[PDB]
Amino acid sequence: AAEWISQQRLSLYRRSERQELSELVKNRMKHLGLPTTGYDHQNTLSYVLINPPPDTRLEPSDIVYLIRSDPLA
Amino acid sequence: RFMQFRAKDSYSLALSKLEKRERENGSNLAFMFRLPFAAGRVFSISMLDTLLYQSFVKDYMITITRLLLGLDTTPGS
Amino acid sequence: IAPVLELAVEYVKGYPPNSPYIGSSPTLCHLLPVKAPFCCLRLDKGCKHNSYEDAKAYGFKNKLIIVSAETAGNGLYNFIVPLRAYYRSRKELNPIVLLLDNKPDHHFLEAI
């Protein structure tokens, strides 16, 4: 069994911090009873353009703040 | 010096004179000749601060200390 | 002396299941075949599996190690890990008694 535990030793030594955090979360989930799956990072940058010029070009993933008129009046 | 205090003991109080003599010469390890420390009964976390300041010159010192304590496990060590 | 040459209950061995914190180096340790229930980790009270209430009723074969700490956390885990490492002799395993002031939380007990 020396070869198997050596394999596990190198694998656990080569594992990163992201794997450590993921395994901690999954261990907590399986201890409380929730399924480990579903836990399956955000390479995104966002900012707010207040009143851009009327010539501004629209990009995907954009969200426009609106003042929508009163539906009741 | 207070870990195992034998007040009625000549040797334990001559160690005080030895420690004073060492401290006169600017020695940082003045506590070293106390019997509890020499026998391994007591340590202070101030050695960890000394280790941290040593790592400014000896970057390998923290890793060596952790390897001796088994805190970090590199295969083949 | 030979001259040096210039050239050349049974316990399982494995890593602890629940590492208590991120960065804890995984060490191959002597482990119980099945995790001990939280009741069996207590010297004070008796349980379904054991009615012993002090260390003499346990009848340890090796001399004990007593840790007098205030609270049990990751520090006590880092204390226990070297004493149960796989290269330490199993025949010379010293029972560890944590003399705590506060009742240990479930995280430390699950870790140990």
Ligand SMILES: [K+]
């Ligand atoms: K008991």
Ligand SMILES: [Zn+2]
């Ligand atoms: Zn029990």
